[PDB]
Write an enzyme that holds these catalytic residues in place. Sequence first.
Site, short mmCIF file in Angstrom:
data_model
loop_
_atom_site.label_atom_id
_atom_site.label_comp_id
_atom_site.label_asym_id
_atom_site.label_seq_id
_atom_site.Cartn_x
_atom_site.Cartn_y
_atom_site.Cartn_z
N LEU A 62 0.81 -1.22 0.00
CA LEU A 62 0.00 0.00 0.00
C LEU A 62 0.85 1.28 0.00
O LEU A 62 0.65 2.17 -0.83
CB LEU A 62 -0.98 -0.11 1.19
CG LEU A 62 -2.19 0.84 1.15
CD1 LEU A 62 -3.34 0.26 1.97
CD2 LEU A 62 -1.89 2.22 1.73
N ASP A 63 1.84 1.35 0.89
CA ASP A 63 2.79 2.46 1.01
C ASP A 63 4.02 2.40 0.10
O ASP A 63 4.72 3.41 0.00
CB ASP A 63 3.27 2.57 2.48
CG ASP A 63 2.46 3.54 3.34
OD1 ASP A 63 1.67 4.34 2.80
OD2 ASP A 63 2.69 3.53 4.57
#
Lengths: 48, 83
Positions: B59-60
């Site tokens: 996600l990051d």
Amino acid sequence: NKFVNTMTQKPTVEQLIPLHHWDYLYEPDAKSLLDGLLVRYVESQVYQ
Amino acid sequence: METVVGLTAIAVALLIGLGALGTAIGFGLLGGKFLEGAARQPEMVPMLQVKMFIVAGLLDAVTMIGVGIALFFTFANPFVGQI
């Protein structure tokens, strides 16, 4: 009457209406499910 | 080169700003599904929290690349050398 044995029938009275690690995946609302199942339960006990 | 400088401040603001915006919405969606499962099956919480950290890495991933490039443009601006 309840079947104690082949030579004995016992008269009885049984209460009908007044009666942990996972949860169910309810498709309809849980009230509709509980309301429907309780009716089937009492009918089944009367038939038995 | 007065136009290049200051205009790179808009580039770093977009790199960190769009990254912060996406990461804050993404964890709201991922986190909401974690609490939804946890409140219905508290027995699975030790496993689901580990599954959450696997997704958090993906996600990051691109947000951390953007943040790194923004810091690089802030302290060692490569565009200024191109005149």
